């Protein structure tokens, strides 16, 4: 979910 965003940057 939205937590995955704390692990890496979306380009």
């Amino acid at each position, epitope marked *: 979910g939205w*937590l*995955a*965003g*704390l*692990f*890496y*940057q979306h*380009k």
Partner: antibody, heavy 119, light 107 residues
């Protein structure tokens, strides 16, 4: 530089469980991503999973899910990795690494722990 | 499964330019990272976010990522640069390291 110190090399029986510690000396694990990466002898790097101590949320590689556990103790600034149901193929150097939040790169790595899985 | 393909070995004459490729499906759409690992040592971050360099990394190290390929460039390669190099990008919420390349510096 923040220094990540990992526990000593160990021999473990197949089917058993191993727990590796990763002590941050001269830094914190709070507001950071703590990740575990392994390397089988003469092989490549393999990402196991990550954990954010502050948000208490882990993310494990689909292949390690249900077999690995990444934890941390706030007062000691020490991260832990537990790998259960050990197989011969789990023989590897286990690295702990720290990286920034919302940035999937690792700027600080520990020295690695060689875990041998043998009868 | 996502596969990041790198040539197993790359050779460079001293002073020349080493180019280490990493091939992946939607690579240009992902931020690529690069790690240097010397024999018996821990990996060292050399490039992050395709072309950014950490403070302690010589300016002769550069990165680029376009289409299906990221490239690590080492201008004026030296004996100091002999190591295994790993590319790294995220796919389906998982950190994926590339195949790894051993860089041999000729003499």
């Amino acid at each position: 530089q923040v220094t990540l110190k990992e526990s000593g090399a160990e021999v473990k029986k197949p089917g058993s469980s191993v727990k590796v510690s990763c002590e941050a000396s001269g830094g914190t694990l709070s507001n950071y991503v703590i990740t575990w990466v392994r390397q089988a002898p003469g092989q490549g790097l393999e990402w196991m999973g990550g954990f954010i101590p502050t948000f208490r949320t882990a993310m494990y590689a689909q292949g390690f899910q249900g077999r690995v556990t990444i934890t941390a103790d706030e007062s000691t600034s020490i991260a832990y990795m537990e790998l259960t149901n050990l197989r011969s193929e789990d023989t590897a150097v286990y690295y702990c690494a720290r990286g920034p939040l919302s940035r999937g790169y690792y700027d600080y790595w520990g020295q690695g722990t060689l875990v041998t899985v043998s009868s | 499964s996502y596969v990041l393909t790198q040539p197993p070995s790359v050779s460079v004459s001293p002073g020349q330019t080493a180019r280490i490729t990493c091939s992946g499906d939607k690579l240009g759409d992902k931020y690529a990272s690069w790690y240097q690992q010397k024999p018996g040592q821990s990996p060292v971050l050399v490039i992050y976010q395709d072309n950014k360099r950490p403070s302690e990394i010589p300016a002769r190290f550069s990165g680029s990522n376009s289409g299906n390929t990221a490239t690590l460039t080492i201008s004026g390669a030296q004996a100091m640069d002999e190591a295994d190099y790993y590319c790294q990008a995220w796919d389906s919420n998982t950190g994926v390291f590339g195949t790894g390349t051993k860089l041999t510096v000729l003499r």
